[PDB]
Amino acid sequence: IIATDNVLFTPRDKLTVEELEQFQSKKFTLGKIPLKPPPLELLNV
Amino acid sequence: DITMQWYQQLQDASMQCVLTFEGLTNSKDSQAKKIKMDLQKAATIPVSQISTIAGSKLKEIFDKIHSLLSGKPVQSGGRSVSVTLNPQGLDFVQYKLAEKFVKQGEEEVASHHEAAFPIAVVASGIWELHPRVGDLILAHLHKKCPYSVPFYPTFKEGMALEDYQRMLGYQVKDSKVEQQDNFLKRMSGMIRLYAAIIQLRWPYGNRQEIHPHGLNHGWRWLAQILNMEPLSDVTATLLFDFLEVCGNALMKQYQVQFWKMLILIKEDYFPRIEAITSSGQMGSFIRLKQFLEKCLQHKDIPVPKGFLTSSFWRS
Amino acid sequence: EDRAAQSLLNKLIRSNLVDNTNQVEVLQRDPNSPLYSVKSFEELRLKPQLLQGVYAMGFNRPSKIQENALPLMLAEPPQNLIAQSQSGTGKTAAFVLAMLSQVEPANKYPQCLCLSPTYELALQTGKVIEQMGKFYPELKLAYAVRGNKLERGQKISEQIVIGTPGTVLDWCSKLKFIDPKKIKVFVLDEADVMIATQGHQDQSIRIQRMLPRNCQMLLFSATFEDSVWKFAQKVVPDPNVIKLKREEETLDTIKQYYVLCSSRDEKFQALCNLYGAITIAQAMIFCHTRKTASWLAAELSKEGHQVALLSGEMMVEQRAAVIERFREGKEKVLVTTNVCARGIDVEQVSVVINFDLPVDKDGNPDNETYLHRIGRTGRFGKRGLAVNMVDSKHSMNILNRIQEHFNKKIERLDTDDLDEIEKIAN
Ligand SMILES: Nc1ncnc2c1ncn2[C@@H]1O[C@H](COP(=O)(O)OP(=O)(O)O)[C@@H](O)[C@H]1O
Numbered sequence: 001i002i003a004t005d006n007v008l009f010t011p012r013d014k015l016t017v018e019e020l021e022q023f024q025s026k027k028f029t030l031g032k033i034p035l036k037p038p039p040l041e042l043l044n045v
Numbered sequence: 046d047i048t049m050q051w052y053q054q055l056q057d058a059s060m061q062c063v064l065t066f067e068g069l070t071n072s073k074d075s076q077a078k079k080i081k082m083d084l085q086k087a088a089t090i091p092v093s094q095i096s097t098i099a100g101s102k103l104k105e106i107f108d109k110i111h112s113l114l115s116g117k118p119v120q121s122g123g124r125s126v127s128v129t130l131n132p133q134g135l136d137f138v139q140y141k142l143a144e145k146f147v148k149q150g151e152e153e154v155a156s157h158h159e160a161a162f163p164i165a166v167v168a169s170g171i172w173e174l175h176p177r178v179g180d181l182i183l184a185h186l187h188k189k190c191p192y193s194v195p196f197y198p199t200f201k202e203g204m205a206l207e208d209y210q211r212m213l214g215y216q217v218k219d220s221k222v223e224q225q226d227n228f229l230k231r232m233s234g235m236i237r238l239y240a241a242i243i244q245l246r247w248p249y250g251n252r253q254e255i256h257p258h259g260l261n262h263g264w265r266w267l268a269q270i271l272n273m274e275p276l277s278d279v280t281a282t283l284l285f286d287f288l289e290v291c292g293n294a295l296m297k298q299y300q301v302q303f304w305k306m307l308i309l310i311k312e313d314y315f316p317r318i319e320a321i322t323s324s325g326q327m328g329s330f331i332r333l334k335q336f337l338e339k340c341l342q343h344k345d346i347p348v349p350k351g352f353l354t355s356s357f358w359r360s
Numbered sequence: 361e362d363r364a365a366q367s368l369l370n371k372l373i374r375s376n377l378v379d380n381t382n383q384v385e386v387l388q389r390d391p392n393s394p395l396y397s398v399k400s401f402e403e404l405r406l407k408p409q410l411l412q413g414v415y416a417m418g419f420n421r422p423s424k425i426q427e428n429a430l431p432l433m434l435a436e437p438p439q440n441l442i443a444q445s446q447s448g449t450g451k452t453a454a455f456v457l458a459m460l461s462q463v464e465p466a467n468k469y470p471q472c473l474c475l476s477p478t479y480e481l482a483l484q485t486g487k488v489i490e491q492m493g494k495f496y497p498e499l500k501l502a503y504a505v506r507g508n509k510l511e512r513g514q515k516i517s518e519q520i521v522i523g524t525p526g527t528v529l530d531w532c533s534k535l536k537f538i539d540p541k542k543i544k545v546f547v548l549d550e551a552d553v554m555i556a557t558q559g560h561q562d563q564s565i566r567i568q569r570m571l572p573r574n575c576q577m578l579l580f581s582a583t584f585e586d587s588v589w590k591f592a593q594k595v596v597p598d599p600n601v602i603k604l605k606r607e608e609e610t611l612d613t614i615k616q617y618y619v620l621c622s623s624r625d626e627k628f629q630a631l632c633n634l635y636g637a638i639t640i641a642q643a644m645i646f647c648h649t650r651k652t653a654s655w656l657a658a659e660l661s662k663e664g665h666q667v668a669l670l671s672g673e674m675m676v677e678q679r680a681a682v683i684e685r686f687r688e689g690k691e692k693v694l695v696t697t698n699v700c701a702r703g704i705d706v707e708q709v710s711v712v713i714n715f716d717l718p719v720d721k722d723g724n725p726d727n728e729t730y731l732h733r734i735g736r737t738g739r740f741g742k743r744g745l746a747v748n749m750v751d752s753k754h755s756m757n758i759l760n761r762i763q764e765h766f767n768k769k770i771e772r773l774d775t776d777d778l779d780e781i782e783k784i785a786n
Contacts, residue, residue, distance in 0.1 A: 006255050008298065023302060028309045030317075033268040035047075037261045038302040045301050082633075082778050089636035096666050097689040105664065122632045122663060145639070153641035156708040160641075160689045216786070224741055 010036040048269065052187060052194055059140075059184035066137040080130055081137075087121035088113060088138045089145040095164045097351070100358040104249065107167050114138065114175060142171075143181035147189060147235065155234030159351025161241045161290065166353065168238075170247025172257040179257050190214055190235040192283055195270045229278070233286045240291035241349075248358060260298055263291050267306060271314055277322040281329040284310070285336055292346040311337050363553040364478050365676060367582075369700065370447050371484045372680040377423055378448035378705075379740065380607045384428050387601035389439065396431035398422055404430055409495040410460055417491045423450035425604050432600055433458040438544075438576040440596050445604040447582045455547045455578050456488045459520060462544045462576070465499045468517040470538045474547040475525050475564055477554045479505045482522045485549055489520060504528045510537065525554070525563040532570055540570040545578070548595060552583035555591050568595050609735025615784060616770035618748040618759055624652070627715060627749045628659055633775045634747070635665075638785035641710045642686070644703070645695045646733065648716035653697040656715065660693065670696035703733040710785075711745040712737060717758050725758055727765050745785060747773065 012020070019034035023042045069081055091106040091113075113119045116135075118127045128134045146168050154161045172179035186193055191214060198212045207217065214232060215223045223231075243263045246256055266287070275281065295303045311334075318330050340346045386395055398404060400421050401414055422430055425445045432439055433454070445451055459472040476482035486501055493499050502516050504523030516537050521528070531537040546568065554560050568577070577596045581588050584603065593599070621627045634640070647653040650671055657669040668682050668691035679699060686694050687706055694706075703712070712734050718726040737744030748770065750756045763770050774780055 003253050004255070006259075008255075008259055008261055025305075028305045030309065030313045031272045033272055033306065033309075035265050035268050037264045038299050043300055043302065078777065082776075085778055086633065086636045090665075093635060093640055094664065094666060094692065096692055098666065098691075102666075109664075122629075145636075148639035149641070152639045152710055153708060156641065157689050160708075227741065227743060 009038065009040045012039045012041050015039065048194060049196060052196065055180055055184045055187060059181060062136060062140055062181065066133040066140070069131060069133050069137050080134070083121060083126045084128070084130075084134055084138055085141050087119055087126050088142050090121075092142070092145045092149055092164075092167075095149070095160070095167060097160060097163050097357075099360045100163075100166075100248075100353065101360045103163060103167065107170060107247070107249075110142070110167070110171060111174060114142070114171070114178070139175075139178050139181055143178055144185045146182055147185045147238070150234050150238035151189065151231055153234070154238050155230035158234075158237060158286075158290075161234070161237045162245060162349070162351050162353050163357075165238055165241035166245045166247055169242050169245050169256065169258075170250065172242075173247060173250070173252055173254070176257060183258070186235065186239060190232050192232060192270075192279065193236050193239050193266075195266055197273065197276060225278070229282055232279070232283065236283055237286050237290045240287045244291055244294035245353075260291075260294060263295055264299060264303075267295075271306070271310060275314070275318050275321060277318075278326045278329050281318050281322065281333045285329065285333045288336065288346070290349045292340070293348050296346050307337065307341065311341060363556050364481060367447065367550060367553055368478070368480050368484070369676055369680060371481070372677070373683055373704070374448050377450060378446065378607065380424055380446070380449060380604060382605050382607065384424060385601075385603045386428055386432075387603075388432075389598050389600050396428060396435060398427055398431050404434060406457075406461065410457070410492070412495045413460075413492040414457070416494065419453070423453075425449045425451065425602065426454050428602055429454045430457060432602070433576070433578065434461060438574065440577040440599045441602065442579050442581075442592050442596050442599045443602045444581055444584050445602075446606045449604060451580045451582075452485060452488055452549065453492070455549070455580065456485070456492055458576075458578065459489070459545050459547070460493050460496065460499075463496075463499065463519045465496055465519055467519065467542075469542055470502070470516055470518060470521045471542060472520045472545040472547075473528065473538075473543050473567075474520075474522045474549055475528060475554070475567070476522060476549050477525070477557070477560065479503075479507065479524060481550065482524065486522050489522075504531050504537075510535075525560040525567070529563050529567050532567065540567075541572055543571050543575050545576045546571055548579045551579055551581035551588050551592060552585065555585075555587055561591055565594055607739075609731060609739055611731070611734060611738075611766060611768055613738035613741060614734050614744040614746055616746045616748075616763075616768060617773040617784065618750055618770050619773050619775055620750055620756075623751065627751060628656065630749065630775045631660075631713070631715075632663070633778070634781060637778050637781035639710070640785075642689070642692050642706065642708045643694075643711040643713060644706070644709055644733075645693065645713040645715050646701065646718065647695065647697045648719070650697045652716070653695050657695040660695065666692055668694045670694060670699045672697070672699055674699070701729055701733075703736045705736055709737055709744075711747060714746070714748040717748060717750075717755055717762075719758070725762050725765065727762065730762060731766075746770075 015036060018032070019036060022028060022032060022034050023038050024045060072078065072081065091109050094106055095103065109119055113128070116128055118125045128138060146164070149164055150161070154164065168182065172182070191198055198209070200209060207222070210222065211217060215228055217223055240263065243258055243260050270280070270284065315334065322330055401411055401419070406414070425443065429441065429443055433441060443451060463471050474485060476485050482503060482505055486503065489501055499520070500518045502518035502521050504521050504527050506524060506527050512535065514537070521531070521538065523531070532540045548554065548564055554564065577599070579592050579596050581592065619630050621630050645656065647656060653669065653671065657667050660667045668686050670679060670682055683700070683704060685691055689708065718729040718733065720726040734744060734746050748759060750759055759770060773784070
């Protein structure tokens with residue numbers, strides 16, 4: 001009796017610093033969009 | 046390779062399934078053909094019945110498949126049939142059911158962009174109850190349309206051009222080759238369906254567990270397809286009819302991060318196609334901009350024409 | 361019989377142009393006057409409010425027939441015209457555009473007059489005026505047809521009139537509702553059906569004869585019949601002529617098959633096994649008798665298969681409604697019996713079924729029907745499918761006969777082995 005949780009977003013941790021700096025930027029950089037989905041903290045950046 | 050490794054996992058896992066019921070297909074007895082006949086029949090008719098009229102009756106088809114697949118007897122043409130007839134049958138119906146979902150997306154959804162949603166919900170719902178069926182869908186979906194992975198087939202040495210087009214998903218008889226236009230639609234309808242499955246959920250059933258193939262696979266698809274050089278006509282086409290179908294659901298989920306992606310392709314990835322595409326093939330790339338110029342300034346991506354509404358679910 | 365109803369239905373269901381690859385023939389009054397050709401609406405230099413309405417209703421550039429018709433009609437001096445092009449090429453939108461160019465809404469009296477064969481068709485033509493001319497404030501429309509109640513001493517103030525042939529004559533001739541000498545443009549829409557009534561032909565000419573000589577005379581017809589062409593010359597003096605030959609349809613891309621069956625219950629069992637054998641989206645079934653069609657559709661519905669039934673008793677608008685749903689994907693199978701027998705421009709039709717063979721009166725093969733039924737499915741390179749149900753040796757005799765005329769093989773399909781049925785639609 002357990003229900004798993006959602007992977008819709010990726011945790012802020014367990015994420016490389018490259019991807020972290022991409023999500024934080026006002027503009028994305030061509031050819032370097034992160035494959036993992038964004039985190040819940042940087043949604044409204 | 047993370048994707049290519051995962052890509053192979055599903056493919057060879059399907060090949061295992063091709064072999065597990067090996068002998069059900071390869072049988073020539075009058076009974077052995079009839080059993081293969083009645084199963085392939087009472088397992089694909091309901092999928093072809095999927096209609097836009099009302100979710101009120103779209104539940105019959107869903108129940109008829111769940112019963113069929115769960116082992117229960119199903120009212121087929123004349124006599125009722127089930128899987129208990131043959132033990133290697135279960136693993137067979139799961140194969141034919143999965144292909145028909147992509148096949149219905151190959152022909153109907155290509156022609157009819159709106160039929161994608163009433164078909165997907167059923168697929169997304171069966172995916173929940175029986176995960177093994179979903180891997181089989183992802184198996185066929187990937188093969189017939191490798192652009193859904195997404196990965197572009199590269200050109201290996203030795204210019205067997207006819208041999209290469211086959212890998213690109215073109216359907217070619219020994220003598221015949223498929224036209225681009227009859228091919229482009231075949232692939233649109235395949236990813237319009239895929240773009241629909243990742244955002245839709247079966248309303249009924251009381252399932253506290255989440256979507257099997259979540260909307261995360263939509264982000265990676267856009268990310269992974271925009272980090273590689275675009276094909277001339279294929280990319281600018283598939284990129285469009287993916288956003289029209291799933292762009293609304295991605296804008297709500299990844300509110301800002303998604304917009305960042307869009308402001309990129311518009312000023313950074315659009316130049317990447319203007320040179321690649323010749324003047325005789327700019328048709329797709331033009332729709333792709335007419336799609337953004339509205340959405341970019343309107344701050345809103347329209348709901349996909351044909352989305353199942355509250356009325357549809359009551360009737 | 362009743363070509364107005366066929367036209368009316370074709371109007372309600374037509375959503376866009378019918379593609380045509382043929383080139384347009386032009387036969388100008390002065391043979392050496394240069395040819396008038398245009399490729400965009402900007403070139404014609406239309407009034408701003410008009411060009412506005414053109415772009416408003418979804419038109420990007422002139423259609424093939426319009427590329428030559430519009431400049432010829434807008435040219436000075438006013439040059440008459442006789443245009444021949446199949447239904448759906450943009451004939452109506454052409455003369456509506458020409459009308460709205462000559463009207464000057466400041467003058468409150470009829471300046472443009474159109475003759476439509478019936479009340480219903482007049483309405484459809486009227487709707488196009490209202491759309492394209494939505495940016496002409498104070499511009500109104502008057503319907504001069506039977507049923508329109510009017511009293512003496514009243515005077516039409518509308519700048520455009522549309523009506524049936526028999527009543528428009530009364531408007532100008534006796535009741536003095538219109539002064540013909542102010543009419544600047546005159547249209548006779550759909551002459552191919554106008555001639556179907558002997559009364560209409562004479563009433564239309566008498567009207568044409570009350571008009572001035574500087575009045576621009578225009579006539580349009582879907583068919584190139586001789587009875588039409590002989591009738592058009594009497595109506596349009598010193599006419600230019602524009603022709604666009606009807607788009608031919610072929611079986612280059614379709615695969616023809618047939619199935620032998622002992623009876624009708626077998627034709628139904630044969631039909632069931634086909635489902636699930638291949639990827640069939642939607643499909644049309646043509647039947648011989650209404651008694652059988654209602655049975656099939658009922659039998660098909662019994663299986664839980666969702667179906668649409670088209671029968672003759674249904675009203676015209678009712679027929680359109682079912683067809684619309686079919687296009688919208690509400691229904692996946694359309695069973696019909698001589699109602700719209702030629703084949704509908706549904707896009708999602710994976711297969712055409714001939715539960716009973718296209719039979720002409722007298723018991724001959726209806727090749728035009730067979731062609732049109734299937735020609736729609738695979739035009740311009742698309743792929744299509746065909747299946748013919750044979751229930752007797754007489755029906756079989758007809759089948760080879762069709763195979764003769766087209767000289768293309770209708771192979772046999774055995775419905776017992778699914779493995780064989782999968783091969784054809786791959
Ligand atoms: N230039 C155009 N561009 C786009 N659609 C058009 C154009 N002209 C007509 N249509 C559309 O095509 C359909 C058939 O128009 P058309 O005038 O009306 O037929 P017909 O030649 O039988 O009178 C209508 O739905 C109309 O809106």
